[PDB]
Amino acid sequence: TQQSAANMLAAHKGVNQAPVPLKMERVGPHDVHIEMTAQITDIEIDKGKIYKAWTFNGQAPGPLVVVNEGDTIHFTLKNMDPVVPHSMDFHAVHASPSKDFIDVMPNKSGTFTYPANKPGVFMYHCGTKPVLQHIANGMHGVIIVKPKNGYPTDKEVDREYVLIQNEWYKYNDMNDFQNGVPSYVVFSSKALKPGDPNTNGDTFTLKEKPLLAKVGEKIRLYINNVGPNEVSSFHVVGTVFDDVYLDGNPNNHLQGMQTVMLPASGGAVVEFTVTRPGTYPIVTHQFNHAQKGAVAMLKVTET
């Protein structure tokens, strides 16, 4: 295991591949092209701590993907990793894992086609053995599938953001990945509209640069806890969730939740009102994880 890690260290030594933009375009009323990369990219996960992350597109978690319910995805993965194969598993899709979530070799590309027939906030991740290693090293993200008939509370929502929770462990350390507590637990935000922040899973960015909102607004968060290993007790300080849709399916409706339990890979659409000006921490209420980085901020102003 650690001999392989020593070999990995030599092969990825000095490798820092600049982020490559996600490419997407609609090619039919129910067909969409998506082109992503697997690449090796240095990310500062805490001040003074660089993690040479295994990523989609040089982000960890990876870039946001948004499609409509009923879209068939024509997906291409370009593997830029000089030595490790990589793959893609979208939780949104119906696919044959052994035919459609297969490995793409270093310096090669693979193309796969599958439908997204279910609305919600789905995890995506690399599906290459050991899957734990590929996820823990940074190969995770979110795909949102917009419901054909929306959510019953759509008209009430004033502003929206995407938040993702993930853990970071000791660098490419399989023993730690399997047996150790996370070194950091973090939130990131991925842009839905021009001007939205787009950040990586780190301990600081969403504290230094809070998400922004106005007094009185109803805020929707599309959220997913990608793990790899921990569950999340999602809570926004100073408010209560008016409405919650588990995994973002409109049918899984809950009301007036203080805290939303998310399994590893679990998602939700949560909506809440901010009644007063100020800064509202966003946490996992498992406070050991909050202490290890998992606190984002929402700054609410009159204007």
- Known binding-site positions: 33, 74, 86, 89, 91, 125-126, 134, 139, 158, 285
Q: Torsion angle of alpha carbons 210, 212, 215, 219, nearest 10°? A: -100
Q: With CB cut-offs between 5 and 8 Å by kind, which of Zn ion, a copy of itself, Cu ion, none does residue 128 bind?
A: Cu ion
Q: Contact between 82 and a copy of itself (CB under 8 A)?
A: no
Residue partners of 176: CB distance under 8 A and separation at least 6: 169, 170
Specify the residue for token string 């204007």: 303
**Least separation, in Å, of the C-beta of 265 and Cu ion?**
6
Query: What residues are designated binding site for Cu cation?
Result: 86, 91, 125-126, 134, 139, 285
Q: Which stretch binds a copy of itself (CB under 8 A): 9-17, 48-56, 84-92, 201-209?
A: 84-92
Q: Which stretch binds Zn ion (CB under 5 A): 153-161, 219-227, 241-249, 280-288?
A: 153-161
Site for Zn ion in 236-275 (CB under 5 A): none
**Least separation, in Å, of the C-beta of 242 and a copy of itself?**
8
Q: Which amino acid is at 120?
A: G
Per-residue tokens: 224: 């997913």
Q: Contact between 256 and a copy of itself (CB under 8 A)?
A: yes
Specify the residue for token string 């399994």: 263
Site for Zn ion in 17-36 (CB under 5 A): 27, 31
Report how far residue 98's alpha carbon sits from residue 228's, in angstroms, rounded to the nearest whole number. 21
Least Cα distance to 61 among 8, 107, 6, 22 occurs for: 22
Choose between 128 and 249: whose C-beta lies nearer to Cu ion: 128
Least Cα distance to 53 among 71, 67, 39, 72 occurs for: 39
Per-residue tokens: 41: 């990219």
Q: Which stretch binds Zn ion (CB under 5 A): 129-137, 169-177, 193-201, 214-222?
A: 214-222
Q: Contact between 262 and a copy of itself (CB under 8 A)?
A: yes
Q: Which amino acid is at 197?
A: P
Site for Zn ion in 160-199 (CB under 5 A): none
CB contact at 8 A, 182 and 292:
yes
Among 73, 93, 104, 139, binds a copy of itself (CB under 8 A): 93
Among 260, 269, 270, 296, binds a copy of itself (CB under 8 A): 260
Residue 152: CB atoms within 10 A of its CB come to 11
Report how far residue 173's alpha carbon sits from residue 196's, in angstroms, rounded to the nearest whole number. 34
Residues that bind Cu ion (CB under 5 A): 86, 126, 128, 134, 139
Report how far residue 168's alpha carbon sits from residue 180's, in angstroms, rounded to the nearest whole number. 11
**Least separation, in Å, of the C-beta of 271 and a copy of itself?**
13
Choose between 24 and 174: whose C-beta lies nearer to a copy of itself: 174
SS3 (DSSP) at 130: coil
Site for a copy of itself in 217-236 (CB under 8 A): 227-235
- Reported as half-sphere exposure (CB side, CA atoms, 13 A), residue 189 has a value of 25
Among 75, 177, 187, 222, binds a copy of itself (CB under 8 A): 177
CB contact at 8 A, 35 and 78:
yes
Site for a copy of itself in 141-160 (CB under 8 A): none
What residues line the site for Zn ion (CB under 5 A)? 27, 31, 74, 158, 218
